[PDB]
Every structure is written in structure tokens, then in C-alpha cells.
Amino acid sequence: VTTATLKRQLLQGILQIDDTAADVPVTYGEMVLQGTNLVTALVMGKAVRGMDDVARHLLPVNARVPADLVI
Amino acid sequence: VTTATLKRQLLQGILQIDDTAADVPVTYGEMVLQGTNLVTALVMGKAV
Numbered sequence: 001v002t003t004a005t006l007k008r009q010l011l012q013g014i015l016q017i018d019d020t021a022a023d024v025p026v027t028y029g030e031m032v033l034q035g036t037n038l039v040t041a042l043v044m045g046k047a048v049r050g051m052d053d054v055a056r057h058l059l060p061v062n063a064r065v066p067a068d069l070v071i
Numbered sequence: 072v073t074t075a076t077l078k079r080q081l082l083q084g085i086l087q088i089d090d091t092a093a094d095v096p097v098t099y100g101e102m103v104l105q106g107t108n109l110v111t112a113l114v115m116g117k118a119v
Contacts, residue, residue: 036107040117051110054110054114055107055110058109058110058113059105059106059109
């Protein structure tokens with residue numbers, strides 16, 4: 001991240017531009033806190049994020065956008 | 072629960088017998104602590 005003047009200073013002779021477009025995710029992840037780590041949120045004061053998996057261990061679409069990628 | 076002579080003085084003319092047989096449970100309860108109360112015991116320090 002730069003200012004406009006330094007970016008114009010950098011794109012002239014120093015850094016060579018790779019691609020003028022990139023494809024980036026378009027969705028936030030989510031955390032819901034229901035099920036096994038809802039009772040422990042209310043009977044005790046704790047909770048674990050992957051409480052569906054970490055209890056088991058014991059016993060997507062993107063979009064192409066205009067960008068400016070340098071090497 | 073008494074001593075052996077208190078029984079002799081109580082069963083004589085004071086306390087009235089009703090029945091001479093009884094049925095009782097013959098197996099204890101059980102606690103296993105496995106499943107999701109094992110994870111709660113190992114990660115945090117509690118269990119229900």
C-alpha cells in the first residue's frame with residue numbers, strides 16, 4: 001500500500017507488472033456457536049470453535065476483478 | 072440402627088412389627104464419563 005505519487009514512481013521503470021486482473025474470494029466465513037458449544041457457553045463459561053470435529057477426533061466461489069499485480 | 076439389647080427392649084411391647092421381608096436394589100449406578108464430557112474434561116477443566 002502506497003500513495004498515488006509513489007505508485008506512479010514505481011510503475012515506470014522499477015517494478016514490472018505481471019497481470020492487470022486477479023480473482024479473489026467473494027464470501028465471508030461464518031461462526032454460529034450452536035449445538036455442543038452452546039451448553040458449555042451457558043453452564044460453564046467456555047466454548048471451542050471446531051467443537052463438532054475436536055470432539056470427534058477423540059474417540060467456495062470466487063470472482064475475477066480488475067487489479068494490478070507486480071513482481 | 073441400635074445395639075442388640077435395644078432391639079430386645081423395643082420389639083417387646085413398644086414398636087410393632089409390620090412385615091418380615093423386603094425387596095431392595097441389588098446393583099449400583101454407573102458413571103462412564105465418555106463422549107462429549109471427556110473432551111470437556113481434557114480441553115477445559117469441567118464436566119457434567
